[PDB]
Amino acid sequence: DAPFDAVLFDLDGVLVESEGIIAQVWQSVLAERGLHLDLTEIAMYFTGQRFDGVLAYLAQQHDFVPPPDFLDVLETRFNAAMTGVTAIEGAAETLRALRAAGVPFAIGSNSERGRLHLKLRVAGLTELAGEHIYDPSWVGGRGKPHPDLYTFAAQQLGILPERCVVIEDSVTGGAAGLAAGATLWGLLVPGHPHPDGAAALSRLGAARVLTSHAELRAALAEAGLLTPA
Ligand SMILES: [Cl-]
Ligand SMILES: [Cl-]
Ligand SMILES: [Cl-]
Ligand SMILES: [Mg+2]
Q1: Do the record's keywords include Cell inner membrane (predicted)?
Q2: Engineered SS bond to 105: which of 7, 131, 179, 223, CB 3.0-4.6 Å?
Q3: CATH topology for 19-84?
Q4: Which residues crowd ion ligand 4, with CB under 5 Å?
Q5: What span, in angstroms and rounded, lies between the C-alpha atoms of 134 and 118?
């Protein structure tokens, strides 16, 4: 009984750390303008939100309306900041282990193509991540939670999606993996923000919810993909 042929990876929160970096930018730019919010609130409510929706949040929850230069200063600083994206601990080790064992894998991300590649570059993961790196431009813009990216990535590997395991840290991405017919394993490495938590991923239908790359590697071995410690 060997359930999987291949692994499909999310990028943000799973292979690279960028949402923590984004949260810190929000935090410092607001702080400079009077408002001091904690990193957990900013990650929870600012990330992946449209600028006008962040403004609405600030006005409703914090009675706060930012100065005229808010939009210009955040863009400067979100720019300067993408260069500091870093590899999730143990991510390179997982990619290295899968390459050594000849297990096919792909990356699916909603990031614009150049930003996807920039993040793998700055995180030192380009060579490990390989050829199968897919953003929504490959599927006509139909990104997660649509299953399209993962269906396509499986197809590019020549593996049936039902025989893939998807490694994700959000409902948006986990949903895309389940809707493609894959098995979902949530990965929530602590000390980095994720858009959703363990209970939401399990209720969504994650078969398990892992908390480190070391844990992931053990699970992949139980599943017959890697060699057990
Ligand atoms: Cl790493
Ligand atoms: Cl994504
Ligand atoms: Cl991503
Ligand atoms: Mg993610």
Answers
A1: no
A2: 7
A3: DNA polymerase; domain 1 (1.10.150)
A4: 10, 12-13, 169-170
A5: 13
For residue 76, the tally of other CB atoms under 10 A from its CB is: 12
Residues 6+ apart with CB under 8 A from 65: 55, 58, 59
Is there a shared CATH topology between the 1-18+85-229 domain and the 19-84 domain?
no
Tell me, what amino acid is at 217? R
Experimental method: X-ray
Nearest in space to 149 (alpha carbons), one of 115, 194, 180: 180
Specify the CATH architecture of the domain 1-18+85-229: 3-Layer(aba) Sandwich (3.40)
**Strand residues in the chain grouped as ranges (E):** 6-10, 16-17, 86-87, 105-108, 133-134, 164-168, 183-187, 208-210
Quote the ligand 4 centre to 195 CA distance (angstroms): 7
Please give the distance, rounded to the nearest whole angstrom, from the Cα atom of residue 16 to the centre of ligand 1. 8
DSSP three-state, residue 67: coil
Closest C-alpha among 129, 69, 153, 227 to residue 166: 153
Q: Where are the domains of the chain?
A: 1-18+85-229, 19-84
Instruction: Establish whether 52 is an annotated binding residue.
Output: no
Residue 212 Cα to ligand 1 midpoint, Å, equals 11
